Amino acid sequence: AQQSPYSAAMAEQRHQEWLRFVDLLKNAYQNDLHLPLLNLFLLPDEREALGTRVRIVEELLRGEMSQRELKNELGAGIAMITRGSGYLKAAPVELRQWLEEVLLK
Amino acid sequence: AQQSPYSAAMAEQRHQEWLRFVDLLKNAYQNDLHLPLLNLFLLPDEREALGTRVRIVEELLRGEMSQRELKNELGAGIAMITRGSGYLKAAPVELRQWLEEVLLK
Numbered sequence: 013a014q015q016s017p018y019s020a021a022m023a024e025q026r027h028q029e030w031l032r033f034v035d036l037l038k039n040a041y042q043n044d045l046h047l048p049l050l051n052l053f054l055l056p057d058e059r060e061a062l063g064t065r066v067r068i069v070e071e072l073l074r075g076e077m078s079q080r081e082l083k084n085e086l087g088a089g090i091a092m093i094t095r096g097s098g099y100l101k102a103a104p105v106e107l108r109q110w111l112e113e114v115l116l117k
Numbered sequence: 118a119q120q121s122p123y124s125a126a127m128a129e130q131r132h133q134e135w136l137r138f139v140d141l142l143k144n145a146y147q148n149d150l151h152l153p154l155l156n157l158f159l160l161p162d163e164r165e166a167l168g169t170r171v172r173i174v175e176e177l178l179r180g181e182m183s184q185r186e187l188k189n190e191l192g193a194g195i196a197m198i199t200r201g202s203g204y205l206k207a208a209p210v211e212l213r214q215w216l217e218e219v220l221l222k
């Protein structure tokens with residue numbers, strides 16, 4: 013319907029594969045195997061990017077850090093700030109409010 | 118290139134930033150917010166890569182697919198298979214045993 017069968021079939025396969033990762037990691041957390049699982053599946057630079065993205069989201073929500081501090085401290089230029097801001101705007105409000113509670117105390 | 122206090126301090130700061138993401142995601146799984154959280158923090162191509170890496174690891178552990186089949190079906194050339202094989206060999210025994218259990222049924 014929304015996609016032609018070739019595109020739909022590939023998208024469904026990718027969706028199943030993504031959820032398989034999500035469920036594997038879900039159970040790894042319950043078994044205290046999440047740290048080595050994430051070391052296996054994410055490269056060091058990918059893990060660093062995730063740590064830095066959390067700080068970018070935190071500082072965007074907090075509102076105190078300047079654009080130039082975002083670049084110099086977190087490597088986030090104008091375009092990245094605009095993309096990150098867009099992701100926050102697109103997220104469910106419930107997630108955004110939860111992030112505020114957890115990341116901002 | 119023996120580590121200096123400067124480099125050690127920055128490495129520990131990056132480590133704490135990574136653990137902060139890990140804990141944030143742990144708590145999102147507990148509140149059923151992991152799916153929107155992962156859409157915020159990972160780009161689509163990064164999510165696809167994680168889904169494909171799970172299949173690569175599964176098929177490496179199962180040992181049935183050939184190198185040509187891994188390339189054709191999963192996009193994993195010989196260099197990536199060598200890296201992935203090395204990550205599995207370096208994983209802690211508890212993780213390798215668990216992955217064999219859950220990925221191979």
Ligand SMILES: O=C(O)Cc1c[nH]c2ccccc12
Nearest residue numbers: 052053054055170173200201
């Ligand atoms: O080595 C890479 O290019 C990325 C990567 C990270 N973890 C992996 C597990 C299996 C296959 C590839 C990867």
Ligand SMILES: O=C(O)Cc1c[nH]c2ccccc12
Nearest residue numbers: 065068095096157158159160
């Ligand atoms: O847009 C990017 O360059 C990657 C990215 C994904 N989620 C983010 C959240 C905050 C800042 C950057 C990103």
